[PDB]
Amino acid sequence: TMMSGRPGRVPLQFLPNEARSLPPPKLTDPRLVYMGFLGYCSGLIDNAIRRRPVVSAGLHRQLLYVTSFVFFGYYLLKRQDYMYALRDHDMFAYVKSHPEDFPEKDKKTYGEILEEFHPVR
Amino acid sequence: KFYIREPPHGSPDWLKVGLTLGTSVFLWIYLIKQHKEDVLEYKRRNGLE
Amino acid sequence: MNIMLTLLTNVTLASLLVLIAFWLPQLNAYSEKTSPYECGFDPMGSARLPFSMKFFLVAITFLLFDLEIALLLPLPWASQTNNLKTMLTMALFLLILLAASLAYEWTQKGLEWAE
Amino acid sequence: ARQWQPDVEWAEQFGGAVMYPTKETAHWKPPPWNDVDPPKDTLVSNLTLNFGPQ
Amino acid sequence: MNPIIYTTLIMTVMSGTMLVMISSHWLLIWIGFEMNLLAMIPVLMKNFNPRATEAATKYFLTQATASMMLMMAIIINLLYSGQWTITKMFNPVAMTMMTMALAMKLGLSPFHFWVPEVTQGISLQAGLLLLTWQKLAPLSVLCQISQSINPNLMLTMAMLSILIGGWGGLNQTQLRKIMAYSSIAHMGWMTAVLPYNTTMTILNLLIYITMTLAMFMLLIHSSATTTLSLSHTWNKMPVITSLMMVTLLSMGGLPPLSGFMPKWMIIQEMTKNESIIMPTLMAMTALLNLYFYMRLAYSSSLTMFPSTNNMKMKWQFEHTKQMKLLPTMIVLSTLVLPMTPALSSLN
Amino acid sequence: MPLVYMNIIMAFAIALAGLLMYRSHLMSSLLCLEGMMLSLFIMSTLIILNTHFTLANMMPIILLVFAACEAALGLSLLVMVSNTYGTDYVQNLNLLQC
Amino acid sequence: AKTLLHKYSDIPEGTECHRKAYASTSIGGATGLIVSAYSIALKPPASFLEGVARTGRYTFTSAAIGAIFGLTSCISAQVREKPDDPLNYFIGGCAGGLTLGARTRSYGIGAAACAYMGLTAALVKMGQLEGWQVFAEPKV
Amino acid sequence: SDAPPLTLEAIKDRVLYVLKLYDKIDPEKLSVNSHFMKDLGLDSLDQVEIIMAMEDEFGFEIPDIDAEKLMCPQEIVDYIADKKDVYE
Amino acid sequence: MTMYIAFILSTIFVIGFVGFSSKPSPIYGGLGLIVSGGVGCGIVLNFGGSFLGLMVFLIYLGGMLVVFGYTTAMATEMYPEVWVSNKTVFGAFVSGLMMEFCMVYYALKEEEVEIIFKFNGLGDWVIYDTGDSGFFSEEAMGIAALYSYGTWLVIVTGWSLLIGVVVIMEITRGN
Numbered sequence A: 001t002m003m004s005g006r007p008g009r010v011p012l013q014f015l016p017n018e019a020r021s022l023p024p025p026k027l028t029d030p031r032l033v034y035m036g037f038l039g040y041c042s043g044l045i046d047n048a049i050r051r052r053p054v055v056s057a058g059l060h061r062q063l064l065y066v067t068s069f070v071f072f073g074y075y076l077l078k079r080q081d082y083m084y085a086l087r088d089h090d091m092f093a094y095v096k097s098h099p100e101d102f103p104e105k106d107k108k109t110y111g112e113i114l115e116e117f118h119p120v121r
Numbered sequence B: 001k002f003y004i005r006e007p008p009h010g011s012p013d014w015l016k017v018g019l020t021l022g023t024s025v026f027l028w029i030y031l032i033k034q035h036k037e038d039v040l041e042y043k044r045r046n047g048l049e
Numbered sequence C: 001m002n003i004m005l006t007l008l009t010n011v012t013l014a015s016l017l018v019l020i021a022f023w024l025p026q027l028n029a030y031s032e033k034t035s036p037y038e039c040g041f042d043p044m045g046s047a048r049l050p051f052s053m054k055f056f057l058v059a060i061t062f063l064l065f066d067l068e069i070a071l072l073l074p075l076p077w078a079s080q081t082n083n084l085k086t087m088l089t090m091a092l093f094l095l096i097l098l099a100a101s102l103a104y105e106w107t108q109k110g111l112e113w114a115e
Numbered sequence D: 001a002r003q004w005q006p007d008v009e010w011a012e013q014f015g016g017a018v019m020y021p022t023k024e025t026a027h028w029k030p031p032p033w034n035d036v037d038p039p040k041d042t043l044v045s046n047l048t049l050n051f052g053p054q
Numbered sequence E: 001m002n003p004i005i006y007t008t009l010i011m012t013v014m015s016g017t018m019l020v021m022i023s024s025h026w027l028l029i030w031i032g033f034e035m036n037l038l039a040m041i042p043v044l045m046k047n048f049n050p051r052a053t054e055a056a057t058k059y060f061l062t063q064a065t066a067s068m069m070l071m072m073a074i075i076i077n078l079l080y081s082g083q084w085t086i087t088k089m090f091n092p093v094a095m096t097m098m099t100m101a102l103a104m105k106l107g108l109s110p111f112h113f114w115v116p117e118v119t120q121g122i123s124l125q126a127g128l129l130l131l132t133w134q135k136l137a138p139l140s141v142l143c144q145i146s147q148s149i150n151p152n153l154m155l156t157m158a159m160l161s162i163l164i165g166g167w168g169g170l171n172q173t174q175l176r177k178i179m180a181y182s183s184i185a186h187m188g189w190m191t192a193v194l195p196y197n198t199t200m201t202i203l204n205l206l207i208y209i210t211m212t213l214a215m216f217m218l219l220i221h222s223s224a225t226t227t228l229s230l231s232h233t234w235n236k237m238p239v240i241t242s243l244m245m246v247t248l249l250s251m252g253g254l255p256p257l258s259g260f261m262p263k264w265m266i267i268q269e270m271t272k273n274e275s276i277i278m279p280t281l282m283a284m285t286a287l288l289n290l291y292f293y294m295r296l297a298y299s300s301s302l303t304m305f306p307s308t309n310n311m312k313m314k315w316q317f318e319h320t321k322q323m324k325l326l327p328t329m330i331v332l333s334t335l336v337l338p339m340t341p342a343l344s345s346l347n
Numbered sequence F: 001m002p003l004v005y006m007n008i009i010m011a012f013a014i015a016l017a018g019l020l021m022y023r024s025h026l027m028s029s030l031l032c033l034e035g036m037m038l039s040l041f042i043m044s045t046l047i048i049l050n051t052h053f054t055l056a057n058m059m060p061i062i063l064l065v066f067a068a069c070e071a072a073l074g075l076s077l078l079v080m081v082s083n084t085y086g087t088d089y090v091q092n093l094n095l096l097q098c
Numbered sequence G: 001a002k003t004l005l006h007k008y009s010d011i012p013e014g015t016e017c018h019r020k021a022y023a024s025t026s027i028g029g030a031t032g033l034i035v036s037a038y039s040i041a042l043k044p045p046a047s048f049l050e051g052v053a054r055t056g057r058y059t060f061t062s063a064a065i066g067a068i069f070g071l072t073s074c075i076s077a078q079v080r081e082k083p084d085d086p087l088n089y090f091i092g093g094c095a096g097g098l099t100l101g102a103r104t105r106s107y108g109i110g111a112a113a114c115a116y117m118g119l120t121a122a123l124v125k126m127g128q129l130e131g132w133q134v135f136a137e138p139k140v
Numbered sequence H: 001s002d003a004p005p006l007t008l009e010a011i012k013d014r015v016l017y018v019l020k021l022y023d024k025i026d027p028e029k030l031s032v033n034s035h036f037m038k039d040l041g042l043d044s045l046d047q048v049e050i051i052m053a054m055e056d057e058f059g060f061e062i063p064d065i066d067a068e069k070l071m072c073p074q075e076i077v078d079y080i081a082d083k084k085d086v087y088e
Numbered sequence I: 001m002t003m004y005i006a007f008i009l010s011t012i013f014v015i016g017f018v019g020f021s022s023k024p025s026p027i028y029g030g031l032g033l034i035v036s037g038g039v040g041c042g043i044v045l046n047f048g049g050s051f052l053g054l055m056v057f058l059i060y061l062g063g064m065l066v067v068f069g070y071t072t073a074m075a076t077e078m079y080p081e082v083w084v085s086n087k088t089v090f091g092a093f094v095s096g097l098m099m100e101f102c103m104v105y106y107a108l109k110e111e112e113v114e115i116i117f118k119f120n121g122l123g124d125w126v127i128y129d130t131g132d133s134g135f136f137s138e139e140a141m142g143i144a145a146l147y148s149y150g151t152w153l154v155i156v157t158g159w160s161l162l163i164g165v166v167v168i169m170e171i172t173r174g175n
Ligand SMILES: CCCCCCCCCCCCCCCCCC(=O)OC[C@H](COP(=O)([O-])OCC(O)COP(=O)([O-])OC[C@@H](COC(=O)CCCCCCCCCCCCCCCCC)OC(=O)CCCCCCCCCCCCCCCCC)OC(=O)CCCCCCCCCCCCCCCCC
Pocket: A041, A044, A045, A048, A052, A053, A054, A055, E238, E239, E242, E243, E246, E256, E301, E330, E334, E335
C-alpha cells in the first residue's frame, strides 16, 4: 500500500545502498540483547522437549541458538531503522513541498485565549 | 547402565560439535567485522571521521 | 455458406432414408418381436446395470495425452519462426516430457488392466 | 484434604460427538479412533449373460 | 506413497504458490492456482480412507468452482479493458467476482463450510499444510488489488468470518475442527484490515502462521486428535502440555503474548480511519475464540484427567523423530511482543 | 456489448448455477464444470479475435490444457467415491458431518 | 437493495408515518425473505409446502417487526414534537421487540428482544446524528 | 430424532392392524388371546404367512424356533417387546 | 439483422447449456455438451478463429467419449432420466429456456442493462475491423508464437501435465 511502490526501489534488496548512511545499531542494543534472550529461551525449550537437562544439556547448540538469533536481529534492526528513517524523510519533504497545507498558525498566549471554566462541586 | 547402545554416543559426536562451534565462531566474527564496516562507512559518509 | 448447405443436404438425405425405411414396409410388431435380444432366452438383469471398466486409468491418461496433442498441433507454423533454436528446444522439451509421462505410467504398472 | 481433580464422570462430558448435545445431533457418533471407517459390504453386481444357444 | 513422489508433489504445491506470488500476468496467476490445486489434491489423500476421499472431493469441488469464478472475472476485466496485468481491476462486476472467488478459496464466510470438514478429514500434517501454506497465494492476490476492494463486501465477509469462527468453535470436541474454526476467525481478522493497510495483513498472517505451526507440531508430538486423547498427555509429556497451554493463551490474544500484537495493531489501523464500531465488535467476538481455547487449556494442562494402565508402557519409550523448529516456533509464538516496531521491515 | 457476448455470459451463468445445484450424480457436476470451461474458452476466443491481440491467441489453448487437468482430477476422485459406495451419489459423502 | 433504505430515509423523521411504516415493512420483508432463503438452503423442509410455510412465517414475522418499529417510532417523534432524538427510535425498537415476543409466544424472548432491539435502534439513531461509519472509507 | 419410544399399546395396535388386513381372519372374531388354530381355524401355513406379515411390518428378521410358538396376538406382542426391550 | 446466423448459433449454445445443466443423466448431458461444443466451434469459426474452433471441438469430443465410458461404468441407474421423465429436470429445463427467451426479448426490444451493462445488438457484424492485410492468418501466427515467445508457458504447462499423470496414478492407487 503506502510504501510498496516508491521510486528508485530495488525489489528484493532488503538493504538499499543509502541505508549505509545511517548509524548502525550498537552491539549492546537492548533489542539485540532481547533477541539473544529469545535464542536462549529457544535453546532451553529445545532441551526440555527432547528430555535433556534443561540448563546444561547442549552448550554448543545453545550457543548456536543465541548467535543465530543475534545475527538475524542485527540486520532486522538495521532494516527497521532504515524504513523509519525513510518514513521521516518522505514526510518532511512532503511538508516542505506543500506549504499551503501545513501553515504555521499565529502564536497566542494563555492570557489572551478564553477557556471556559467548569467548577467542580 | 543401558541394555541398548544408546544411539547418541556416550562420547560426544565430535564432528557435529566441531561444526556447530565453528559456525557459531564464524557468525560472531562475521558480525563483528560487519559492524566495524558499517561504523566506518557511516562515519565516512556523514563527514564525522 | 457452402458447408452449411453440404451438412443440411447430408442430414436431410439420411433422414429421408430413415423415413422411407420406416413408412414403406408393412409393420407388424407384437410383444415377442420387440423383446430384448439374448442368444435364445430372456435376460436376467438389465443392460442399464453398471458395467465395470478395466481401463479407466488409460482413459484419464488419454485425456491428458489428447491435450498434449492440441499443444503439439501448431508445430508446422512454429517451424517458420526466425529463432529456430528456441522453438526446436521447446518442442523437443514438450515431446520429451510426454515420453517421460508415458514411461512413468508404463513402469508403475499403469498400462495394465485391472484384474 | 487434597485438591479436586476431574473424574470419569467429568471427563465423559468432553467425550461426545459435539459439545452441547441436542435433539437433532443426539444420534451422531464420534469418529473411529483411527480415521478408518469400516468397509461397506457392497454387493458386487456382476453382469449375467446368456452365451448361446443362438 | 513414495518419498520422491511426495517431495515432488510438495515442491509442485510450493512452486504453484510462488508462481502466483511472482507473476504480473493474470493467466500466470490462474495457472499457479491450478498447479497448486492439482498437486495438493493427492497430498490430502496420502493416508487412504473414505474420510480422506471425502475431504479431497469437497476441497476439489470448492477450489474448482473458485477457479471458474476467478477466470471469469479475469476475462470480464479483459473485455472491459484490454489489460492482462494484475492492477486496479477497472471493472466493478469483475471485481466483485474476483473478491468472491478469492474469499471462497480462503474460506471466508459464508464460503467457510468446507474448511472444518476438510481439516477433520485429513491427517495433521495435511491439515498443517492446508491451514498455513494454502493461505498465501489468495492473500497475495488480494493484497495486490486492495485499491479496488469494495470495503462493504470485504468487511462484511470479514466480520461474518470472525462471528462464525467464534460461534462454531464453541461446539467442537475434535481438535482439527477447532483449528479450522480458529483459522476462519483469523482469516476474518486478516482481511478486515486489508482495504486500509496490507502491512497489517502480512503481520497478522505471519503471527498466525507461527502460532498455527506451533499448535500443529505440538498436536503431532502428542498424537492427539480429540479432547479426551489430549487429556492423557500430562501423564506422559507434562512439558508439552504446559507449552501448549501458553501457546493457546497466545492464540487467545492475551498480552503480553505474541497473539496480542496483530489485533492490537489492526485495531489501531482502523482507528486511524474512523472505523470505531467494527474493531470493538471484533474484539468482543474474539472473546469466543479465547473461551474455547481456555476450555482446551482446562482439559489439557490446568487439570489432571484420569489415565489408563497401559500408559505405563509408554513411559519407557522416547520420541523416535523430533520435529525441528518447534522450540523456535513456540518462542516466536509467545515472547515476541517487545519487538513489535520491527513490523516496519514489512513495507 | 454485442448480443453474442451476452449469450456467452448467460451460458456461463447457467453452467455455474447448474454446478451449484446438485441432484444426485457427481458426473453431472463434472459436466457442468466442463461446460463452464467451454463457455470461458468461447468468451476468451471471441474477445481476443475481435481486438486483434495476436500474442494472446495461445491463451485459450493453455486454458483448455488446464481444463483437462481439472477433468482428469475429478474423474480420478469419482472412481474412488464409486469404489467406496458403488454409486457416485453425493449424499454418501456425509461422513465429515460429525 | 439499498434503494429500500433510500425510500425509507428520504421521508422526513416526523412526517408521513404511513409512508415510513410502508418503507420499514418493505425492509423487514426483504430481510425475512433472505433469512428464509438461507434457512431453506441449509435446512431443507422435507416438502415444498412446509418450505413455503416456513418462508411465509419468517417473512411475516420480519415484516410485522419492521412495520411496528417504523410506525411507533414515527408516531412518537411526531407526537412528542422531538425529532432527532433516540428515544423515539428506542421506543419503536422496543415495540418491535415486543412483536417478536408475541410472534414466538414467549415473554422472555419478548422482554429480552425489546431491550436489545431498543438499544440497537437508539445506537443507530445516534450514529445517524453524529456521523458514525460502520464501513469506514479508507482515508489514511 | 429417530422413531419415538415405541410402547406396548402401539405394538398391539399394529399387530391387530396386520391381522385385520389379513383376508383369512374375521375381524370381529379376532381378539388379543385368539388362538390361531382353535378359534380362527387356520393351519401352520397361515400362521407362517402371519409371522411373515409381522416380519415385514416391524422390520426385523424373525427366525424359526421361538416363532413357531407364536399362537395368539399376545405372544407376538410379547416377543416384539422382548426383542425391542419395550417395557411400557 | 443479417440471417441471424451468429445469433442463432449463440442461442443454440445456450440451449445446449440448459440441456446439460438440468442434469438429465450424464449420457444426455454429454450429448448436450457435444452439441454446445460443435455450435461454439461454429461461433468462433464465424469470427476467423478456425483453428481454435476445430481444436476445442476435437478436445471435447475426446473428453465426452471418456465421460460416456465413465457414465456406463459408474454413473448409471435402472431408469436413466431424460428431460421429460422427471419433474425437477423438466422444470429446470423449461425455466432455463424461458429465462433465455426473456433475456433475448428484453435485449432486442430495449437497450436495457441486465447484469453487466446495457447492450446494443444491431448484429455483431458492425464491430468488425475492415482489416485488409496479410499473406498469413493472425490466429495461426499468434498460436504458433507459443514456442518462440511463450517458453515460460510451455515449461509450466508441460510440468503440469507430467504432474497430472503422476497425480492421477497416486489418487487411484487405492490401498
Ligand atoms: C518478563 C521478565 C522475564 C520473564 C520472561 C518469561 C519467563 C522466562 C522465559 C521462559 C522460557 C525459559 C525456559 C523455558 C523452558 C523451560 C521448561 C522447564 O521445564 O524448565 C525445567 C528446568 C528445571 O528442570 P530440570 O533441572 O531439567 O530437572 C527437573 C525435570 O526437568 C522435571 O521435569 P518435569 O517433567 O517433571 O516438569 C513437569 C512440569 C514442567 O512444566 C513447566 O516447566 C512449564 C514450562 C514453562 C512454559 C514456557 C513457555 C514459553 C515461555 C512463555 C512465558 C510467558 C511469560 C508471560 C506471562 C504469562 C505466564 C504464562 O509440568 C507440570 O508439572 C505441570 C504444571 C502446570 C502449570 C502450568 C503453568 C505452565 C506455564 C508457565 C509459563 C511461565 C514462564 C515459566 C518460566 C520458567 C519455567 C522453567 O527449569 C530450569 O532450570 C530453567 C530455568 C531458567 C534457567 C536460568 C539459569 C541461568 C543461570 C542463572 C544465573 C543468571 C545469569 C548469571 C549472570 C549474573 C552474574 C553472576
